[PDB]
Amino acid sequence: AAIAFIGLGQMGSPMASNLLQQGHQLRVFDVNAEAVRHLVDKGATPAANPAQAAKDAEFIITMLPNGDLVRNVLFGENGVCEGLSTDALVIDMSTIHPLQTDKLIADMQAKGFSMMDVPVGRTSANAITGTLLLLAGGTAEQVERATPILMAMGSELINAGGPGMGIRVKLINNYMSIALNALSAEAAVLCEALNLPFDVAVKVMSGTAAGKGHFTTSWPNKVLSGDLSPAFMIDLAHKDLGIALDVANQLHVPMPLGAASREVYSQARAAGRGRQDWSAILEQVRVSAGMTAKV
Amino acid sequence: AAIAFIGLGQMGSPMASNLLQQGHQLRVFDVNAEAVRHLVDKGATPAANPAQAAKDAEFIITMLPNGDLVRNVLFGENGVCEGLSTDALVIDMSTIHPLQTDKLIADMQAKGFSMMDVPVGRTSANAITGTLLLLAGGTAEQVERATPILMAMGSELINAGGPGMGIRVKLINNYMSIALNALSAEAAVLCEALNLPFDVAVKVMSGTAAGKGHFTTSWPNKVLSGDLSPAFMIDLAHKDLGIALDVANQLHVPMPLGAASREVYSQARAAGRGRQDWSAILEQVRVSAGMTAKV
Amino acid sequence: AAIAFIGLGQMGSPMASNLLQQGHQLRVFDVNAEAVRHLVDKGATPAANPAQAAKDAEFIITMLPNGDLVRNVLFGENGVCEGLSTDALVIDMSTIHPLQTDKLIADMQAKGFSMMDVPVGRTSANAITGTLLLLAGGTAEQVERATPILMAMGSELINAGGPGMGIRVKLINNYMSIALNALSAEAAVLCEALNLPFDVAVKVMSGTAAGKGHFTTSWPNKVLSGDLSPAFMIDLAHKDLGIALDVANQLHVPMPLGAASREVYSQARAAGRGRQDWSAILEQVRVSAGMTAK
């Protein structure tokens, strides 16, 4: 197919490279002329701007650092919209604000253009080997049309379930992993301060929610089944957090996420949940967010 | 064997019950006379106080709510120490402050008595079926001697690798799981606010550090190998957290752990780590705790 | 003077109203037709868009909700720049991102136009009576030129000392007051949970840094003089926070700012500051922010 590829960064370059290997004709653009030259050496045609990249393209892929740059490439001076056919499909593979993705898709549809969000999981090493995780937003029809192109860049495609759902699931995933890293560090540094070999902690945690997560362990048969009868009471969880923070403060291990988490359990106790299962923290956060209680 | 069991609460009662089933002779004590009566009906001998429970016992188990109650049962009026043989082994299976465990073990050794820490993972349902996770502190010799008794109450034993290491690994495990629950709730409620079905997010997160944890995914070949060359740069992780918090604040989903986590990544960027792998957050927290940089 | 006023919200409407009262000729624009009509009834000339508002104006005031809207009104379709004289002075009185203010001022200077930041302190009640606090950014020349106009809308002018310094001081002020409100609430609710009448706590706190602030009490003769010898050691402050959080957690009073503050003191103790004066927390935060130690 005729493809325009805008954004030849650490992810974009290997993604574009895999499309060339699968026999697509690429017109490429990036602000960095050396990055363009590298794709031209692999068989891409250079374009002077996004509009020229888009001219006669069936698929327009953007892979850019943020939503302001995506908007500028699509709607700015010499933007994709100046070169775009109404039969073409724009695929934004960028990680940007989901409400910016919604507004770009709406603004494209107002001009008779089709756009879908397919951000990716895994890092540039996986981009090189075409083993990215494709988080495919867009309509079922758009995902079906894009899939042959997308499978050149990734090895696994997840149906995110609609326009803007790809960037939403990417954002939930990255929010959880990035925050989890800071909490993981607190546990590991407290472990070191207590002179406990980390491998012993990892062995224990690999067998509990500590290492496996709550989503598929503690939650399914309790809060997610509407059952808050306790396996492990909020009062006990709150007590154990207080012990961890007592130790951390005696050993000068700063634990901001632990300190914040205890005040969440304290709010749950103030709301009368002390004898509920620890999975009831999900319902407490829903109520704090103004949502209707499910249990 | 001849066993004393002190503490017949939601965990202790079924633990004591399993020891009776395996043919041990138990002398039991608790402040609740009905809890004692229930074990006496199953063939336990009652004790008037901990000293009487301990008399002629080879193994003395405590399962109590906190370190002050363990100290009072061991060292107080009619305490275990008044009835204890120097050949006997005290096993505290309580979840208490680890520096309190160390001081109890030291105070016992000063009187020529042997004591180890074997707190347990999993909840009272597992206590009933003898499927607790045994977190065995103590010397190699103590863990070897206690193992046949402990396997009556649990189905898996982890050798924590020394006196006080059992209570340490229990505290690290519970700190991590209890705080993780609060973070998991933030991610799940943001997911709901963005109209993304939870199961779709869990399917994606099950394949990344979000669902699998950093301990065995992102950390081993980076920070834990002394390599902070980036797979995923701190600058990008910090930017994505900012987007998550922007969305949460627009949708009034309070995310205190996320908000705290972004200020940790901000401090990492201030310390010059913006171009390092996200696993460098472990080193940042070590430095914040006054530890010497490893990388 | 000939003034354009863009933004007739809860602050903008009474500010524009005070300029009319002091005899200025105003050309007004807002997207809300009722807000424009209210100013027209007081003697303003309506303009169809920002460009037309700016035409023949000596001073162009913007009072808008955020920096994206200020940029759109200045640089967008029918924007101020299409009607602006190089002799005119643009005054943004909005509370927006300070780095956006810097970029707007620079973008205006690149087109030969003059722009200054004069955000305002105090509320719409003060906007009605012309008793706002004027937080005047801009060059000394711009502040001098604007002052006669600004004194129609405010009763007190602070010269913030340069382009972008007005929005900076407004942001520092509001950051501190808005966050302080959340901490004040934690202290007041813990007070109630301990069955202590609030008036007793306020009487005590009015005599200490609790009620008077650290900026002019504990800091000047210690950290701000480069003296970290202790009047009140970080170790003691950290211990007392632990007691407060123990009580709050027993009484189920959630104290997230207190919980966060103890982990800041914990980091100071990790950095070897436990025997330093509590004012050394400022130096700890500077180091955490990557600044050169004092």
Place this chain on the structure above:
Amino acid sequence: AAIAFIGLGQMGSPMASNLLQQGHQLRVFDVNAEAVRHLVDKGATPAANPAQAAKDAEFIITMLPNGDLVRNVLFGENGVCEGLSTDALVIDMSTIHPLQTDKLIADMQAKGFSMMDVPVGRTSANAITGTLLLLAGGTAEQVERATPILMAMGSELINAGGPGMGIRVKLINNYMSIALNALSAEAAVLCEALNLPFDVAVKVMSGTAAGKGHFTTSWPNKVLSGDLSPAFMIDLAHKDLGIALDVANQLHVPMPLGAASREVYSQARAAGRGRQDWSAILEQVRVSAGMTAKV
């Protein structure tokens, strides 16, 4: 008067010294022999233990680091209670847990002894000059009886309004001042990172709640009068916090208290308070603590 003084630390030594200057006869005790020697040189009589210090004393003052040490000095081996007259008055000037103060006062009353809590504000420099703030707990009768003694050590007495109210107001004061210091540092460092001279910020803040506090400015005529009609809406305050956090994160100034504060305003918005006065944050925190809404 005949006074026993137990605790000759950085605060206790100068407090005892001022009682000597005002012509009282002191029996002093501390485990630190250098501190005792210094007071003996100023005319104090040394005592071997608290019981001997208390013998024939009308007033017994304790100034100790924590509630366990106060309990040990009053009720332990050779404790004050062994030397105490029922006509004497015990004054604990320590900063300890208020529920420990309550239990000490109750335990003393059970033995027919009278005890009040009079902790102090201001630092050791003020202790030297007798210019401490006296935070007088106790009954009206106890405060009246103690006042002549207390005015030797402090220049201002506040009647806290009952037994245990002195330690409560000391804890509220120190909680607020100690946490405020950390918030003050965030504002001052953000100021420096923006290249704004700090003196300009202090001049502005001295005229607003930023420098004067909310307790006597924004609160009295709004939330404390049951009026949540907005002078400054929660929505606007929340927006401005988001701008401050955006700037802090771009300039890598870590602002954990600011980050936490924005999630409190976010919870207020979730509870429907966005168009309420910012003083409604007090009501939000009361509701989060399980208290009945007032307004």
